[PDB]
Design a binder for this molecule. Structure first.
Ligand SMILES: CC[C@H](C)[C@H](N)C(=O)O
Ligand SMILES: CC[C@H](C)[C@H](N)C(=O)O
Ligand SMILES: CC[C@H](C)[C@H](N)C(=O)O
Ligand SMILES: CC[C@H](C)[C@H](N)C(=O)O
Lengths: 75, 75, 75, 75, 75, 75, 75, 75
């Protein structure tokens, strides 16, 4: 199994709507709007790294409101 | 009382327009146009953290001219 | 209640031992060793902001093994 | 007169003692320990740019506890 | 021969579209979608530096889907 | 007198047109499109720091094609 | 299989000697000294994520000449 | 001809002495001590890219007083 945290910067004022969309996805276990350089922190759990790759490319990167991400995979 | 410093990037030709909105807000204690990656730095104070949350999420991040923000809460 | 995520950098080879010490703290709700710029991601919760201030400055940052912390307070 | 905000990263656990030292300097108008990538924010005011550079050089950079800094001159 | 690595950020939902354009170009030796701040990394080779200049300025930076690039020329 | 170098990131494919506009300004002495994290490097010379401040706010920041800048003042 | 690009900053003047050491490692597929903020780019391939972390930990991070690194896992 | 701008970080208090040594090199066309993240900005010109490669790696980065360099090649 894979557990990872994705830190994201979103367009100003869209963090809440983006968070709600992410929370509705099965891969997403937790999501919070936060203070600092990043706007959202999202915890995801997938069966494989390939699945995590697909979550990033097929879900995250197709959302225009998300601008910059940093992913940290638990080990 | 909660004190925080907010770094902001505004749309081109709008940093003065944003400063004018900021300098009319009760929560804004000081505001400066600065050199660098960010256009402005603003020191704000609210009674509680819940109030800061509302202020930043609603009055700052939804301001049309704002493109990005990074808030540093102080101790 | 205040929720925050602490991104940490520990001295080399101390990640695991630091994590076990953190997991013993009542404020720590989740802790993970991760691959990336940061060595650990820790979810903490306190009753007030003043308590978090105390926990981060007097407990967490005083741990000999911890070199850097970047705390993201949740809205 | 030159006004500038200096963001600094300190050795973990030394931010308060550093802030107190800084607060004792005449050029320092305000100083706060903050959450985020940076640990301290300081507002300084000097008569000239020359004096600002001398300040960070003779005082700031000569403080072992201070590890990294970013200066933002106010306009 | 000049070799360079180009880090690129593309518009949302366009990273595959860009990869398809890149993988049809003679100058592209390898191309990968990557995690992080950048969406793709591409290794290119040209006969001369003047050719690289033309290639990057005209075929890469004018590509409609490209939002930002950072090119690292190799020795 | 003040001499400074301004490093800038521009929208992809607009670096040349931005450079031409800057070169036409009396304050600008040299300008080059460059490889790396920055897209343009511009050398400016003004009578006072106040004039440099005005160049940044009234000229640079009103140009939508310019996205992020870093200014280094000679001393 | 996991493929990743590692960008590194080395002590000034030690980049080539470091590159040669890296090139002697089986996990390293290619390596180049480059212009820019980073001094070296290395492409590595390991069977697992676990092995990638062990690689940078046992080899990369244990090289005194290497001062800073940024890893980008390829999808 | 190849033109490049080298952004440098020197050991503390060595900026001026490093600058005078650089000004003596035929490749160096302009050199300035500056306020900011970098200590010096140096404009250099060589007849070919291969010569610049040699100049930066075998001359510049071998200078004991220089700690970091980020070279931006001009188009
Ligand atoms: C609510 C905080 C927002 C999202 C941003 N991260 C900031 O610090 O300003
Ligand atoms: C109290 C905050 C400390 C100093 C650090 N900046 C952090 O966010 O963890
Ligand atoms: C010509 C280079 C462009 C402007 C950008 N700086 C890059 O490195 O890709
Ligand atoms: C040859 C390039 C060196 C290593 C450094 N990255 C620079 O740009 O100055």
């Amino acid at each position: 199994m894979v557990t990872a945290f994705i830190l994201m910067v979103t367009a100003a004022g869209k963090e809440r709507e983006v968070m709600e969309k992410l929370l509705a996805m099965p891969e997403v276990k937790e999501a919070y709007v936060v203070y600092g350089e990043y706007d959202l922190i999202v915890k995801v759990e997938t069966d494989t790294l390939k699945d995590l790759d697909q979550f990033i490319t097929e879900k995250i990167r197709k959302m225009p409101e998300i601008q910059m991400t940093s992913t940290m995979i638990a080990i």
